[PDB]
Amino acid sequence: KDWFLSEEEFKLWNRLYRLRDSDEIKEITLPQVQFSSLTTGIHQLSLSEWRLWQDHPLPTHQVDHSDRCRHFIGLMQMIEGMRHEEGECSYELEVESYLQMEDVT
């Protein structure tokens, strides 16, 4: 068949799925890619609002977590572990005795 919705599919989409100007949310948007160093009816999906839920691996269905997602989870765990340090930093204490000056500038 066709790439576009048939008349019947279009009717279904219009009455079941399409968001409308009178719905409480009339549009869902995704944050756009922006590199900083180089809306009443509009819901922007957040990747940060639920940050406190992210220090544990969440359920999967058919797609296993990736290595970068495991790193993300581990970093969130590290941040949680340091959140209530004032001043003197445990990470510094764990690594700074291994520093070799020849490695750096």
Which residues from 65-84 bind another protein, rule CB under 8 A?
65-69, 71-76, 78-79, 82-83
- Write down the least CB distance from residue 45 to another protein, Å: 6
Rounded alpha-carbon distances, angstroms, from residue 30 to 54, 57, 61, 92:
19, 23, 23, 36
Residues 52-91 that bind Zn ion (CB under 5 A): 65, 69
Please calculate the CA angle 62-66-67 and round it to the nearest 5 degrees.
Answer: 155
37 scored as a contact of another protein (CB under 8 A): yes
The site partner of 99 among another protein, Zn ion, none (C-beta below 5 to 8 Å per kind) is: another protein
What are phi and psi for residue 46, nearest 5 degrees?
-95, 140
30 scored as a contact of another protein (CB under 8 A): yes
d(CA 99, CA 48): 33
Residue count of the chain, please give it.
105
- Write down the least CB distance from residue 22 to another protein, Å: 13
Chain residues that interact with Zn ion, rule: CB under 5 A:
65, 69
